[PDB]
Write an enzyme that holds these catalytic residues in place. Sequence first.
Site, PDB file in Angstrom:
ATOM      1  CB  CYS A  18     -11.387  16.795  67.327  1.00  0.00           C
ATOM      2  SG  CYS A  18     -10.209  15.611  68.182  1.00  0.00           S
ATOM      3  CG  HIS A  26     -15.523  15.878  68.413  1.00  0.00           C
ATOM      4  ND1 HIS A  26     -15.675  15.267  69.717  1.00  0.00           N
ATOM      5  CD2 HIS A  26     -14.744  15.289  67.600  1.00  0.00           C
ATOM      6  CE1 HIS A  26     -14.543  14.321  69.720  1.00  0.00           C
ATOM      7  NE2 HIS A  26     -14.171  14.448  68.249  1.00  0.00           N
ATOM      8  CG  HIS A 122     -23.283  24.421  80.201  1.00  0.00           C
ATOM      9  ND1 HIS A 122     -24.791  24.587  80.748  1.00  0.00           N
ATOM     10  CD2 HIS A 122     -23.566  24.199  79.070  1.00  0.00           C
ATOM     11  CE1 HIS A 122     -25.517  24.191  79.900  1.00  0.00           C
ATOM     12  NE2 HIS A 122     -24.837  24.042  78.797  1.00  0.00           N
TER      13      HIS A 122
HETATM   14  C1  LIG Z   1     -26.270  13.376  78.282  1.00  0.00           C
HETATM   15  C2  LIG Z   1     -26.220  14.771  77.545  1.00  0.00           C
HETATM   16  N1  LIG Z   1     -27.099  15.520  77.168  1.00  0.00           N
HETATM   17  C3  LIG Z   1     -26.693  16.763  76.574  1.00  0.00           C
HETATM   18  C4  LIG Z   1     -25.532  17.195  76.529  1.00  0.00           C
HETATM   19  C5  LIG Z   1     -25.071  18.536  76.137  1.00  0.00           C
HETATM   20  C6  LIG Z   1     -26.105  19.418  75.419  1.00  0.00           C
HETATM   21  C7  LIG Z   1     -25.674  20.446  75.034  1.00  0.00           C
HETATM   22  C8  LIG Z   1     -24.626  21.203  74.823  1.00  0.00           C
HETATM   23  C9  LIG Z   1     -24.114  22.560  74.440  1.00  0.00           C
HETATM   24  C10 LIG Z   1     -25.340  23.681  74.738  1.00  0.00           C
HETATM   25  O1  LIG Z   1     -26.108  23.649  73.988  1.00  0.00           O
HETATM   26  N2  LIG Z   1     -25.382  24.102  76.019  1.00  0.00           N
HETATM   27  O2  LIG Z   1     -26.144  24.852  76.039  1.00  0.00           O
HETATM   28  C11 LIG Z   1     -23.838  22.496  72.951  1.00  0.00           C
HETATM   29  C12 LIG Z   1     -24.088  21.384  72.225  1.00  0.00           C
HETATM   30  C13 LIG Z   1     -23.842  21.357  70.833  1.00  0.00           C
HETATM   31  C14 LIG Z   1     -23.354  22.782  70.181  1.00  0.00           C
HETATM   32  C15 LIG Z   1     -23.032  23.581  71.054  1.00  0.00           C
HETATM   33  C16 LIG Z   1     -23.264  23.761  72.522  1.00  0.00           C
HETATM   34  F1  LIG Z   1     -23.106  24.947  73.291  1.00  0.00           F
HETATM   35  C17 LIG Z   1     -23.601  20.502  75.566  1.00  0.00           C
HETATM   36  C18 LIG Z   1     -23.815  19.141  76.362  1.00  0.00           C
HETATM   37  C19 LIG Z   1     -24.579  16.473  77.350  1.00  0.00           C
HETATM   38  N3  LIG Z   1     -24.786  15.124  77.633  1.00  0.00           N
HETATM   39 ZN   LIG Z   2     -27.906  24.546  74.760  1.00  0.00          ZN
HETATM   40 ZN   LIG Z   3     -11.997  13.807  67.326  1.00  0.00          ZN
END
Ligand SMILES: Cc1ncc(-c2ccc([C@H](C(=O)NO)c3ccccc3F)cc2)cn1
Ligand SMILES: [Zn+2]
Ligand SMILES: [Zn+2]
Length: 345
Positions: A18, A26, A122
């Site tokens: 961003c 973020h 995801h």
């Molecule tokens: C309410 C709520 N709870 C949890 C999330 C969320 C958690 C992890 C990821 C992601 C992840 O780990 N996915 O496996 C991630 C995060 C940080 C850094 C890197 C990432 F990939 C994406 C969204 C969203 N909303």
């Molecule tokens: Zn994860």
């Molecule tokens: Zn931002």
Amino acid sequence: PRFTTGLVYDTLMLKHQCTCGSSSSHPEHAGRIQSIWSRLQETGLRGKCECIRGRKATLEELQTVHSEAHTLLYGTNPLIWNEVHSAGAARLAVGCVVELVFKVATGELKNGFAVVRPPGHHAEESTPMGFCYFNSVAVAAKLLQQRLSVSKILIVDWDVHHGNGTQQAFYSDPSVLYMSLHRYDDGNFFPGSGAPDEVGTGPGVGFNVNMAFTGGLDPPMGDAEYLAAFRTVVMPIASEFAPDVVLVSSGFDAVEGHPTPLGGYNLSARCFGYLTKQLMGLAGGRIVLALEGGHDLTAICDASEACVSALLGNELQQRPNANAVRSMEKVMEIHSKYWRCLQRH
Ligand SMILES: Cc1ncc(-c2ccc([C@H](C(=O)NO)c3ccccc3F)cc2)cn1
Ligand SMILES: [Zn+2]
Ligand SMILES: [Zn+2]
Ligand code: NA
């Protein structure tokens, strides 16, 4: 190119950022891969590895997993989402993983680690979510099927969240075994998918394994619980499947120091070294780890160090809690129907 561990990194993946430039607002930020890369430099591990050049995935390659419309929307930018660099960066993540995967699959490198962002697991056919746009690992697997006639691929996902995208990609395919260890808590964690009873569909029945931990953080899962999951579920099924190549969706957010809902678990970074070492005994050591989640910089740098050290061939008790035992038993019980190693469980 020397027959040793491969690394892939690219600075243009830092530009999926961003314009405010803050880590705070973020959590999927540039500093995740920047810090891992310098950690591998500092420890002298980069110098023992072959660092390979990456590239952008073509729209055609992305379309092995995603719809045309989805690949156009997040893979091109005519006149977080960086309006200038995200499309290129997302494509780079896929192409970096693909490049490293092929070098390992062909025998050019022994194994590898892809230091990539944004993450992939995801991302569904036409839907981005969880900070993922294209499923890098799924695209790499598809390309192995279509361009190297690889008969059996194991995808292990040890990110603490369920890789719903990867499960979707291979749900009806018996030639790809998707194997996720994740915090599930009966469907009440993020994303909410990945029940033990989701075993695949059509010809794919039995080839989706959700090692879903349930019972919450009472107590939280740790080294002993994952080691037991590896001993009783992951390795027996993985060994019986006998993959030609192993891909690891390697999130490090199960490591100690990730508060819920980014984690909640107490794995040590060292334990990931031990898990990597156990997966290296499959498929003639043809294994590639690609970074998925993991947020805390010291945790992911420690866990990366231990994985890359294990991949190079260096080196470095407790009963599993009742929640973990109950979780494994539920999975073994479902998968006793499909796998000889679990017939009597
Ligand atoms: C309410 C709520 N709870 C949890 C999330 C969320 C958690 C992890 C990821 C992601 C992840 O780990 N996915 O496996 C991630 C995060 C940080 C850094 C890197 C990432 F990939 C994406 C969204 C969203 N909303
Ligand atoms: Zn994860
Ligand atoms: Zn931002
Ligand atoms: Na499958």
